[PDB]
Amino acid sequence: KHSLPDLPYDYGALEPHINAQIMQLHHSKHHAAYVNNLNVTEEKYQEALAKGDVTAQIALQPALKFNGGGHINHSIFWTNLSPNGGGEPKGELLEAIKRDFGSFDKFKEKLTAASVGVQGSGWGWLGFNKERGHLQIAACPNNDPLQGTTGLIPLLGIDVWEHAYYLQYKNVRPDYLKAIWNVINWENVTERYMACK
Amino acid sequence: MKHSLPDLPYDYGALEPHINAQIMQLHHSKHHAAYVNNLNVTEEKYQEALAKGDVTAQIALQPALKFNGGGHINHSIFWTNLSPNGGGEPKGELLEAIKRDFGSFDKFKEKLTAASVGVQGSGWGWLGFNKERGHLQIAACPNNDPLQGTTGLIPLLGIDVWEHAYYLQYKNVRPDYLKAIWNVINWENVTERYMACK
Ligand SMILES: [K+]
Ligand SMILES: [K+]
Ligand SMILES: [K+]
Ligand SMILES: [K+]
Ligand SMILES: [K+]
Ligand SMILES: [K+]
Ligand SMILES: [K+]
Ligand SMILES: [K+]
Ligand SMILES: [K+]
Ligand SMILES: [K+]
Ligand SMILES: [K+]
Ligand SMILES: [K+]
Ligand SMILES: [K+]
Ligand SMILES: [Mn+2]
Ligand SMILES: [Mn+2]
């Protein structure tokens, strides 16, 4: 049974950048539903596999990817933010950002652009490409998770579903993207990067 | 338990001159055999991932499961949908339903032909049964995506329009294959599948 992780901080800890009502809904309603539906779907898959029911396995794929991906993505996202965040990373991650994107500021522009560019629901990611040994930006639709659908290892995700920002920023997704940089937990992103090497 | 390649219920040359023996043997003994085997490999990996709660691994396996699982589902139906005893028109309640839902048998053939010719890339044309609406319905599916798993419709008749289903004999002219296949449709099987829905 997958479980809803506790947040690493309280729901208001990322104010004013992401308001407490959003964090509370996002974790306690949206992520909770992913977890609950993921568990239901995995149990149905166990049954289908035991019976050799390939039709049922395939019919369950959309629920599995959506809720499973929701669980994967949100579990990473909470750790990617912190009340003590903001600013720039240091060390090898900063070195890699400068090497692969030219500068920290150009990296921000490129992840911002990928995130603002999602049409519909989805996510922007900074990932690590293990084959190539370098950083890579990608966008993913809906809750499709980065590693399961692209092979890239997730380092930093930005949720651009409307429920991630709408109560506060309404349609103005770019204002949310500007604000979120103030709460990036570069410690966590660095840990994820260093685990890849 | 493991999925198995069903034997083809007739000789590889039983459908000549409509589908030749070289196609039938490659399609069954090479293409379908590979789907079954790859499906069983993917299922095994999926069980492991599920036991470990590895959702990333489950999602990464979805393309192979749908493609090879769908391949197994669709080809298993297809072999039974063809017969040397086939061709002609169905009878009874299936014919009545075709006339009711499509206007006539020939109109139905045109619509299923159009759906099958219209696949861009690899895929299948299907006649299915919509259990909720209680009537027949035509759909096209990409690659090996299977009808029931992706649409909920119950498959009655499938036509494979992957190039391996026809290319050796008909080359690029997919409409020549589709003309030919009507001569070997096993309407007895299609009828059985339809009656099982009702
Ligand atoms: K907050
Ligand atoms: K703000
Ligand atoms: K988790
Ligand atoms: K540089
Ligand atoms: K999704
Ligand atoms: K958010
Ligand atoms: K079998
Ligand atoms: K013969
Ligand atoms: K497929
Ligand atoms: K069926
Ligand atoms: K064929
Ligand atoms: K011919
Ligand atoms: K012909
Ligand atoms: Mn979200
Ligand atoms: Mn085929």
Author numbering:
A (entry chain B): 1 to 197
B (entry chain A): 0 to 197
Copy text from the publication.
Human manganese superoxide dismutase (MnSOD) is a mitochondrial matrix metalloenzyme that catalyzes the dismutation of reactive superoxide radicals, generated as byproducts of mitochondrial respiration, into molecular oxygen (O2) and hydrogen peroxide (H2O2). As the only known mitochondrial enzyme capable of converting reactive radicals into diffusible products that can be further metabolized or exported, MnSOD serves as the critical first line of defence against oxidative stress. In the wild-type enzyme, Gln143 mediates proton transfers with the manganese-bound solvent (WAT1) to drive redox cycling of the metal, which is necessary for effective superoxide dismutation.
In addition to H2O2 binding at the canonical LIG and PEO sites in the treated Gln143Asn enzyme, our results reveal a striking accumulation of five distinct cryo-trapped H2O2 molecules, either fully or partially occupying the space between the solvent-exposed enzyme surface and the Tyr34–His30 solvent gate. These new bulk-exposed peroxides, named Lb for Ligbulk binding sites, identified in this study have never been observed in any other peroxide-soaked MnSOD. To validate that the observed Lb densities truly correspond to H2O2 molecules, rather than misassigned or mobile waters, we performed a trial refinement in which we replaced each Lb peroxide in the treated structure with a fully occupied water molecule, as in the resting state. However, this does not satisfy the electron density, as shown by the appearance of positive Fo − Fc difference density around one of the missing O atoms in the trial structure. Overall, H2O2 treatment does not appear to significantly alter the active-site architecture of Gln143Asn MnSOD, except for the partial displacement of the manganese-bound solvent (WAT1) by a partially occupied (∼35%) H2O2 molecule bound at the LIG position, opposite His26.
